[PDB]
Structures are given as C-alpha cells and as structure tokens.
Write a structure and sequence with these properties.
Layout: H1 13-48
PDB class: transport protein
Keywords: katp, potassium channel, vascular
Entry title: Vascular KATP channel: Kir6.1 SUR2B quatrefoil-like conformation 2
Length: 49
C-alpha cells in the first residue's frame, strides 16, 4: 500500500497483492509453528537431562 493512490490503483495490483502479503502470512505461520515446536522439544530434553 505504498503507491496505491487514487490515480493508479491498478488492474494487476490484486494479483500483485497476493504475491506479496500472501507470502508473508504463510511464512509467519510457518515460523510460529516452528518456534513453538522447537521450544517444546528443548524443554522435554532438558527435563530428560
């Protein structure tokens, strides 16, 4: 939403929007899951330790 002014909204912007922000959301989900899982394993092993 940098240059999305009234003059040039675009006809390919929506496709383009998915290409940007869609990727970010997917990545965020992946990172979040990875982080929770990592810690869980660490804790279990520490207890085991």
């Amino acid at each position: 939403t940098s240059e999305y002014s009234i003059n040039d909204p675009g006809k390919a912007d929506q496709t383009f929007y998915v290409a940007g922000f869609s990727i970010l959301c997917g990545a965020g989900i992946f990172l979040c899951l990875v982080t929770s899982l990592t810690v869980e394993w660490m804790g279990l092993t520490a207890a085991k330790n």
